[model samples]
Target: KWSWRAIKSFAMGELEARKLKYPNTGTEALLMGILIEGTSFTSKFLRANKIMLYKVREETVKLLGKPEHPPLTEDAQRALDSALDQNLKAGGIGEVMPAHILLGIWSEVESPGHKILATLGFTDEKSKELESFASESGFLDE
Candidate 1:
């Protein structure tokens, strides 16, 4: 049940990526970890929408001294099969990806990546927002 840890992990990497504006999303591990998990993305869809790409971008930059990378969890693995797996059963990817990443945003962490979703006005619609984004930006296919 590390769903919470994963999003914080995802955000750590994501916000780090945003802070750097890397040529690539630095949270490759996080998103790869996340979208694969696909739980946080959907859980924090509106959260995800405001979580990573647009979320991280448009949201907070006032985080701690970004580590070399961000957080990723063991559950992330299940998330992939679970997330990607469910799309087949859940009627496609409209809300799957975000579901994974979104859940990730909620956890005990210092990154605003997670906290922002808490007090903020989002954390709902990003299911598709993140899944769509993960597909296009991270997942790149399924």
Candidate 2:
């Protein structure tokens, strides 16, 4: 049951909540968080639709039946991923990575080729918070 602790902490309970932000990390972590979160919903959708998999494009964000997907622009992708990672961390899901999260990381690497190399998902507020921390701690210089 110790292994399941991260999952419990991430969800904040025994029951699973559909949408949540993740913790922050490198570019790869951000994309992985997206993949994990996406799988959460896609898995549910699959059960409902009786399909085994889903290939959701950027446009599919609009039809999620909940919060509108943030814009899919490059900046937005970075923001979304960073936010996911941040939330995951804030909730203590640090060690709770799902298997499919790797798909998102691979997708980002293959599609973008690591030029920008953004952070994991973080909200604008979180971005500012991280920037502030970086400046204060001299992390930006490195």
Candidate 3:
């Protein structure tokens, strides 16, 4: 729970580091935030599967384009909203943590972030595998 603060810090950092000074934190930035933060079990799992941060950055830049000062696109807002919904559905009382955000990103099958994951071979089955790993490894419980 405490790590959520770090995750948010990373997200904001990503927004700052972008080639484009996006006004609103976009999903692409959020995804980079997760990979850059690299403190969560999800980040570890992604690394174990060969989803490197550099590669993700390259793919995101290529796919999403570096739009300057871009505000939160509808796709990104939707994903963030979905994160909150996911937290609530998973019995989270109020806070939306890193895991919830990751799930939200995954849920956006059409988002550029999802496309990046797909390019890195993250299918629905892979998502299930990660979720199962999280449960079995007590990450979810944590």
Specify the highest-TM-score model's number: 3
Candidate 2 global CA lDDT score: 0.30
Q: Please, what are the lDDT tens digits per residue for candidate 2 over residues 107-131? A: 3542321222222222234324333
Quote model 2's TM-score: 0.20
lDDT of 1: 0.42
- Clashing residue pair totals per candidate (backbone < 3 A): 33, 19, 0
Which candidate, 1 or 2, would have the higher TM-score against the true structure? 1
Better of 2 and 3 by lDDT: 3
Q: Which ten residues in a row have the lowest lDDT in candidate 2?
A: 13-22
Q: lDDT (CA) for every model shown? A: 0.42, 0.30, 0.66
Q: How many clashes does the backbone of model 1 have? A: 33
Q: Ten consecutive residues with minimal summed lDDT in candidate 1?
A: 23-32
Best by lDDT: 3
TM-score of each candidate structure, all chains considered together: 0.32, 0.20, 0.75
Residue 58, candidate 3: C-alpha displacement in angstroms: 1.0
